[PDB]
Amino acid sequence: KKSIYVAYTGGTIGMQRSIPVSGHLQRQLALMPEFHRPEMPDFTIHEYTPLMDSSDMTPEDWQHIAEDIKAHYDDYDGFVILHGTDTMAYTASALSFMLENLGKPVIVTGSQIPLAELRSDGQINLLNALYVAANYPINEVTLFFNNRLYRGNRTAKAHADGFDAFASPNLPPLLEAGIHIRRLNTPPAPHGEGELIVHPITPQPIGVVTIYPGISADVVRNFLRQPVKALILRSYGVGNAPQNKAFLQELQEASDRGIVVVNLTQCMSGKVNMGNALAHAGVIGGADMTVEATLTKLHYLLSQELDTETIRKAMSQNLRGELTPD
Amino acid sequence: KKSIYVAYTGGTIGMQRIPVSGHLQRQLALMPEFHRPEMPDFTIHEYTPLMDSSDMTPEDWQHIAEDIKAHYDDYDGFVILHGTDTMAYTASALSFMLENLGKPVIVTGSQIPLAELRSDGQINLLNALYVAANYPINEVTLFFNNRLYRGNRTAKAHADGFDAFASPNLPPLLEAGIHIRRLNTPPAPHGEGELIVHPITPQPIGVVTIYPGISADVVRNFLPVKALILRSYGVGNAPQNKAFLQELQEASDRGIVVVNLTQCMSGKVNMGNALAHAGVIGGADMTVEATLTKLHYLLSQELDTETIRKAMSQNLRGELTPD
Amino acid sequence: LVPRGSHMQKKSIYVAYTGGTIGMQRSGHLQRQLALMPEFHRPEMPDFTIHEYTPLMDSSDMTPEDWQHIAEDIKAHYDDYDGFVILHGTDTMAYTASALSFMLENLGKPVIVTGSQIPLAELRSDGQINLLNALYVAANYPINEVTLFFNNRLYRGNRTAKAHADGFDAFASPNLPPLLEAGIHIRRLNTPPAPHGEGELIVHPITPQPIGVVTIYPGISADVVRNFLRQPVKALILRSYGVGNAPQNKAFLQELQEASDRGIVVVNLTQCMSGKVNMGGYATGNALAHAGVIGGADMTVEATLTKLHYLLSQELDTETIRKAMSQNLRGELTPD
Amino acid sequence: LVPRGSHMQKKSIYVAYTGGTIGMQRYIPVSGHLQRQLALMPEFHRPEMPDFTIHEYTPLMDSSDMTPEDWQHIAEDIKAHYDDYDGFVILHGTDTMAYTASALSFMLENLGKPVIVTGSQIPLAELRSDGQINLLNALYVAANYPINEVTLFFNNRLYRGNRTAKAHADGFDAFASPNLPPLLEAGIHIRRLNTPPAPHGEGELIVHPITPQPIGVVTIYPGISADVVRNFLRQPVKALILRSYGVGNAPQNKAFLQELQEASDRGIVVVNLTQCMSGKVNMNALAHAGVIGGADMTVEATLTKLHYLLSQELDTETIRKAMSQNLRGELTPD
Ligand SMILES: NC(=O)C[C@H](N)C(=O)O
Ligand SMILES: NC(=O)C[C@H](N)C(=O)O
Ligand SMILES: NC(=O)C[C@H](N)C(=O)O
Ligand SMILES: NC(=O)C[C@H](N)C(=O)O
Ligand SMILES: [Cl-]
Ligand SMILES: [Cl-]
Ligand SMILES: [Cl-]
Ligand SMILES: [Cl-]
Ligand SMILES: [Cl-]
Ligand SMILES: [Cl-]
Ligand SMILES: [Cl-]
Ligand SMILES: [Cl-]
Ligand SMILES: [Cl-]
Ligand SMILES: [Cl-]
């Protein structure tokens, strides 16, 4: 039998109506017979302490997860991370950067309704992720939800109230479950062979600016003066912003102070393609990356001992399948 | 039949290679389908200057609303040609500024210029004209890729696609195929009486995205600001960070209107009731486009902070779904 | 909108276990499996009673006598329960839902057909969730129509078709939106109501009736129509192209006109997954209509087959059947 | 993924104008009308466009009146012009466009130039027509994205022709490819999907001609009997397509199975498809009765594949095998 490790980090899946209650998720799984059917892999559940609402997660929580995977890596055939839905895509994106040369599947899942509440998706998303980790292994950080497996660094929580909570707007899913499980012909991510390398991260102050009609030079000035190390712009369309000379001079001053300024689309899908004023102002195009990928990629790259110039070039390069190259 | 007014404000649809005055109208004169018997009569007004929609300011919404007001009595319907990058903001703003609207106002444009090969500009404009004449809905709407959406429900979702706009929390109002079908989407609250056009004045508003590792400093900075939109996780959650929550209550105690929306493409905010205790108002399933233009509208009127806070959670123009 | 019913009293739902994939094994097996699944016994759930059919049937072996058996079992238990779930094989579930819609007049309680693509006994079963949702919907959202619940959506039965053979989203309603969608919350869609009678349930008989189903395709001959004009045939369904077009061939049109002359009901449908028949649009006259073919609007083949079974089994003459076939009787078609 | 061809030389595309809604006027064909409307539309004459030559068929046909002889006529027209043009666009009525595209896929072997079938739901230059954009796109794809397959272009997607079906009678998105992603999608940019390649031969184009073949199309529905089947045996029939439930299920009662086994004993090729819009046949029982599974083929691909194979001097065993084999990209192997 394959053996799967399950990191139970918290989230809706394990909660009760009144809140997280320690031991409750595992008491439920003990009284559902589907989990110890002979077709199932063996699995072990590690309950984290404390159990966290994913909306309370900080980048240091990504580290604690990556180090948990690293400790268990040699002893199991694959890894399932149970997680709250609110920041699931940010965790899946972070783990894709931090886990280099990954040689076993890592699948992040959870539920929109608690295992404890009626009509829960928990039992079905967990059973599917175990079965998929054992039988259809893909050596990438993935997110499994509502009968699809997505590349983790391509995912976004798209549908706050739906069982189809997550989308992968710029990439098809990797696998789809029906009567059969079907691997799709989605191109593989760049994929290192060799020993697993797990990259620690350190806190990094990053701002996220949304472009909208009437935005002022003040917000950029704002982030210049509380030293941020990086600024993500959610720009219109394929990466457009108002022509405003004061706005542009603040972006230019940020880059002159060594702040990494990255331009993403605010649209749910599409690719940035930016005379060329933002570029003139030292802004880097983020291609079709999500904000989740872009933020976690910055945490990854700022934590390594890299020059601003090296970081600015690495931000537009496909490191782990997060973006579609030219 | 009918007579349709066309406001050509700028945008991709009219560009070459750069907007160029007279290029859109020179192109339409060489395409027979427009002047054809089953079409309505229409007139194009070219704005001066023509604008990339990414350069629009809230004052540009006022110029468009006032243009519609001047033309309202003399035409059966109104088509607004606009760049795609901020089309949903303009459609949202016009829905609040135009009260008791009694004729269709449809915003459209193209993802490829009329002058480029494979342009969608001809078909989106012809469809808008035909629908404003023959299938009038008395609301501000956005027509794109064979669907008509409620304008204050729209968002530019697909930067590279012909299907560039979505209405994530509301089905379209109409769909075009061999026939044009009205869908059974519930009507918006709709005043009858004389058109009223609400002018707006500049208002400083900030837009904060919640993400892992956000600090209290962002909120502390915005504390030159009359309102703050939070793009929260899921159904409206944010980290429990006491410093963060203390800056939000300090914002609300200084009379700043703080509105919680979802960062998800679709869903409804339903908010330890910590944000609400910190004076944050839930914005239900409103888009950022609708919330931002609704705050410009309400802050421009003679209303105190408490009336604006109450109005932000009410369905004024079909922008949100009650209870 | 579908009604939001009171939750104040504990409901009792009758489950007609007809057979299907849900109860199968690699019997009494379904009922023991539900006893062992604690979700089915929570305070928030309705009480339910399973009637296991003898024998249990693969839905591929269903006939119209089976639709009648199920209608009789609903009528037998109607006054005793608050609603009905029909557990059924996926292959012909849309035919059954469509038939029940026409047979059950003055229906004042929900009837929901469901099942699963994978057996409850197998890993990755959808049966637990489709059945649990059906029971919870029958108790709490008690729409007085025959409906079909699959993969978090409730559909009007007589608008459904099995569209995806391998998918958990097996069913669609190609010409009407779903009545209800389930997520964190159960949402009711603006779907306008079907025609509704009043008083005690009346079950209209549905008998076996010889009906031929002709697919129009390039190279089809006059001999196919001539072939069905032999033996008993009472009605023909033409699966035509697009908005209802067929070859303009004189032998073909003459064989069709011969059929309507002899009292055969000939109904024109689209072969397409969605859209609406509108005859005569792409040549000068209206050739099929002049041959006495009746337009079936946007009906599915499932709805059309069961509607003909229903109307031929009633006390109606040929002219009245022809007229009724293009009339919206139960929400199966969208009027002009 | 579809090739991105050179733009350096001006291409020449041949347009087979068979008929169809695209060229009609108010509900009738008129000779010369489509060609004059195109002369009058500047976008078709821009420098970035290929050169094109229209052959107007006589008479122009409603595609609902097409027979298999019409597939033969189109294949021969392609073969007659093949060396002279860089690509081929077939303008056609929507109703049977998917059957034509399927038929051409089997009939054309060693195809080294694109062949794209397109048309419109509304007649050209008629209000709200999709004909200008479906034809402009087909010509630009044929010139620039020269996939060596028979394809179908509609509503900003290029589909593999022998995977397509008219799914939406009233919609501008009329066609679907339910069991394969599209080859190409058009937006601001033309995107190629990495849809893997069909089998490709090499050398000069070879046309595999067809000759009439009586084929029956049986829908499985509740109450169908061994007699309904025995009736399909009471004409000249050489092959029977069953549109079975779900993953290829039919009544398992002994009469029905004996009737199907008698059909196969008489040398009839009986092929089992799903009646579903998507999915794959997976059947003892029917197999024991001589029935061949058609995997995830459409009815359009199965019917045209049988016209191709039955018109060849092949024994029944060889045609049965060939029916379950992926010859042109029409089906997904196990
Ligand atoms: N997750 C995403 O990045 C979606 C979208 N680009 C946004 O800016 O929120
Ligand atoms: N237009 C929208 O508001 C989409 C999404 N709620 C966002 O925060 O960007
Ligand atoms: N179920 C349906 O009726 C779909 C399609 N009209 C068919 O002819 O099978
Ligand atoms: N075109 C198709 O084959 C769709 C569906 N399998 C049918 O039987 O019609
Ligand atoms: Cl949602
Ligand atoms: Cl790697
Ligand atoms: Cl896009
Ligand atoms: Cl003004
Ligand atoms: Cl109850
Ligand atoms: Cl499927
Ligand atoms: Cl349709
Ligand atoms: Cl001339
Ligand atoms: Cl060219
Ligand atoms: Cl050769």
Numbering used by the authors:
A (entry chain A): 3 to 20, 25 to 280, 286 to 337
B (entry chain C): 3 to 19, 25 to 230, 233 to 280, 286 to 337
C (entry chain B): -6 to 19, 28 to 337
D (entry chain D): -6 to 19, 24 to 280, 287 to 337
The article reads:
L-asparaginases catalyze the hydrolysis of L-Asn to L-Asp. The genome of E. coli encodes three L-asparaginases, called type I, II, and isoaspartyl aminopeptidase/L-asparaginase, respectively. The active site pockets of these enzymes are shaped by two protomers, one of which forms most of the active site scaffold, including all catalytic residues; it will be referred to as a “major” protomer, with the second protomer called “minor”. Yet, as we demonstrated here based on the reinterpreted structures of EcAI and the new structures of EcAII, under some conditions a citrate ion can be accommodated into the active site cavity and even displace the canonical substrate or product.
